């Protein structure tokens, strides 16, 4: 397989990171993890938390093996619905699309 092909290593990485904004109060890491695996082969994962009640900031993020498996995960997680509350997707290293254009010129 794959994974084996090159060594580990403990540096952390923004764009093999997705964000994953919207989250419901059931939301844990764990959660993003295991769900995060129908994508690719997920590494780490990171929930945000509140100072005051320790809570989840309504927000977290899941880390891949490889930036190919995280670009993936935001085709196939994005505007839909966990726990019956819509949750938006993309690239740790950015926020929201800013143009957009025609599939050929």
Partial sequence: ?????????????QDATVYVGGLDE??????????FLQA???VNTHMPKDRVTGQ????GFVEFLSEEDADYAIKIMDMIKLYGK???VNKASAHNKNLSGPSSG
């Fill in 1 to 13: 397989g794959s994974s084996g092909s090159s060594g580990p290593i403990s540096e952390r990485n």
């Fill in 26 to 35: 059931k939301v844990s890491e764990p959660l993003l993890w295991e769900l």
């Fill in 40 to 42: 690719g082969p997920v």
């Fill in 56 to 59: 989840h900031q309504g927000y």
């Fill in 86 to 88: 819509p949750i938006r």
